[PDB]
């Protein structure tokens, strides 16, 4: 099955932490990532993009120590810094095990899909969220998924959250189709 293939592809991309961690939940996070279209996963593998699962704070990792005390873009006024943020995506991907669900230090529909969508946007699709095509779709529908002061202002964030809705499960996929039809069709064609 395609999901099995995607899980095999992910076995070459996911990095598990050393020490004690929740192995069952880490597997659950991988299983949810396996719903992403294989074309994107294969491209992540080809670019040697690693999806790092973490048992501690992001900024405890050497490569993110420079973000200690830094307030993420769009997080102004939350009183939180990258030290408190459970996931990160872009040129890399890093995710705290156990914080997948909405409300676990974030309000994304799913942490690992949102973060990985950033890496797909930036690495695989050469920042398509900044393209003129997407900006026109973002201008119309970017305030239709809630969190309008964040998703409605940053097209890369609207892309990542829409991507997460599309691939998390059938319920969120349907919700995106109803709320953001042009975005839905855009993602549908993106995978062709």
């Amino acid at each position: 099955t395609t999901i099995q293939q995607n899980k095999d592809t992910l076995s070459q991309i996911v990095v598990f932490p050393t020490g004690n961690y929740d192995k069952n939940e880490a597997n659950a996070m991988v299983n949810r990532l396996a719903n992403i279209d294989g074309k994107y996963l294969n491209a992540l593998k080809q670019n040697n993009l690693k999806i790092k699962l973490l048992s501690g704070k992001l900024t405890d990792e050497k490569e993110y120590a420079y973000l200690k005390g830094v307030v993420p873009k769009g997080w102004e006024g939350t009183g939180k810094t990258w030290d408190d943020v459970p996931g990160l995506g872009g040129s890399t991907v890093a995710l705290r095990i156990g914080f997948s669900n909405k409300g676990k230090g974030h309000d994304a529909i799913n942490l690992e899909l949102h973060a990985t969508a950033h890496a797909i946007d930036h690495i695989v699709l050469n920042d398509i969220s900044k393209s003129a095509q997407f900006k026109q779709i973002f201008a119309k529908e970017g305030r239709s998924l809630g969190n309008v002061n964040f998703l409605g202002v940053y097209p890369a964030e609207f892309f990542a959250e829409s991507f997460a809705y599309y691939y998390l499960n059938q319920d969120t996929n349907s919700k995106l189709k109803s709320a953001c039809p042009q975005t839905y069709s855009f993602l549908q064609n993106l995978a062709k």
């Binding site: 990258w82 943020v85 996931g87 309000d107 998703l151 964030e157 990542a160």
Partner: peptide, 7 residues
Amino acid sequence: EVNPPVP
């Protein structure tokens, strides 16, 4: 580049 989740 780095991007956070939804606050």
